[PDB]
């Protein structure tokens, strides 16, 4: 069985869930990126309208009742920066200490909070408060996520060749203001804070520059985005602040190149977490040389010890092969399976309706690698699959939860599992075609439909683990 009071719940993004019924928010870069006609006919976005979505902004108490019925006791909710501060906060100046380009200090004091108090949407603050109160009044675990890809238009405007939602110096200063603002009013409500959701996915896709060097100075801006935030938030909250990260079980092509595996894991993830926990930015300096861009200290205590917990996201593995001084995701396996077949992988394993092969052993592998390197409290903040007819999700949920249970027993300090997701939602560039929910949403009528896999969650939550009668669904390979 799982540990006592283990957290079974769901994760939610503001842009993917909120809109659909009322209170349309058009003030995000992703909204215009979704509606751009050239992006539609060039197959960058699906063309689906996010304002025709789940309606979680208004229907959240009824969707929370369904989570309660299936025994959930946790929720990860993302706050939209566009709704709290719909207008620019640049006019509010703050003390900013820098050196050779590294933002070492952003002093957010209480005279800044009341200054930001006049520009904030007090009605949007009350709506999020009502959503969070609806979660905590049921005795549930609450995790607030500040940033989930969508950025206010005054921060980034795709109008005026990628989305461009990266971080720069001016974006970091404004973000720490909004980060400290959230911790000022919700520091006693949120059980844990997450500054950003999958930032590695952002600075990988936010620019046409896929070079390793520019990838890491982009990551650098996100590194300071959390480090300077964490400082400002901890002024008003006593709760664990961490990062929700995109992860895949990195593997070499047939385990012949284990050094390339550790190469990939350091370039994409462990460079980030070694800076925010220890201060190792030798990657950032190593990059900054071949760029002729100014670099600072290689070990910065402004960045270090800035992770109280890690939000692990896992969906599939990631098999890679060395090319020329580089690596390539092997098509036909892992996240890149949907290129040789949409029904079976090269390993002969089932594939999700979005092209990601089902590899339940990877949720043990990714949790173990994170624990064996840092040993902090962790959480599965996202885990699920695109499966409309519920063909594979019942076996997906059980098999992954038992590989995670194998991880808890082996020492991993994971105290929560947040399935993605309770309901279907807007899967960004692919629209509503990708249905990840334990319950299915009819976007024409906004009606909620329980999928059978949601009743499997009801059985696991009731027993705090997988009973013997559900072990056949837990088979890893199918």
Author numbering: 1 to 160, 167 to 484
The article reads:
The genome of C. divulgatum encodes three GH1 enzyme candidates, from which CIB12 and CIB13 were heterologously expressed and characterized. Purified CIB12 and CIB13 were crystallized using the sitting-drop vapor diffusion method, and their crystal structures were determined to 2.55 Å and 2.22 Å resolution, respectively, by molecular replacement (see the section “Materials and methods” for details). Both structures revealed a classical (β/α)8 TIM-barrel fold with a spherical shape, which is typical for GH1 enzymes and is one of the most common protein folds. In the retaining catalytic mechanism of GH1 hydrolases, one of the two glutamates acts as an acid/base catalyst (Glu204 in CIB12 and CIB13) and the other acts as a nucleophile (Glu388 in CIB12 and Glu385 in CIB13). In this work, two representatives of glycosidases of GH1 family from C. divulgatum were characterized. Both CIB12 and CIB13 were active against cellobiose and lactose but showed substrate preference to cellobiose, and therefore were identified as cellobiohydrolases, EC 3.2.1.21.
In addition, the CIB12 structure contains two small antiparallel and one parallel β-sheets and six short α-helices, whereas CIB13 has four antiparallel β-sheets with two β-strands each and four α-helices outside the barrel structure. Both CIB12 and CIB13 structures revealed the presence of two protomers per asymmetric unit forming a dimer with interacting residues located primarily on two C-terminal α-helices, one side β-strand, and connecting loops. The cleavage of the glycosidic bond involves the formation of a covalent glucosyl-enzyme intermediate, which is then deglycosylated in a hydrolysis reaction via the attack of a water molecule producing the free enzyme and glucose. The glycerol molecule in the CIB12 active site was also positioned close to the side chains of conserved His148 (3.1 Å), Trp149 (4.5 Å), Tyr321 (3.9 Å), Trp426 (4.1 Å), Glu433 (2.9 Å), and Trp434 (3.4 Å). Additionally, both active sites contained several aromatic and charged residues, which might contribute to substrate binding including Gln16, Trp30, Asn203, Glu207, Tyr341, Trp362, and Phe442 in CIB12 and Gln16, Trp30, Asn203, Phe340, Met357, and Trp359 in CIB13. The crystal structure of CIB12 also revealed the presence of the disulfide bond Cys172–Cys212 located near the active site, which is not conserved in CIB13 and might contribute to a higher thermotolerance of CIB12 activity compared to CIB13.
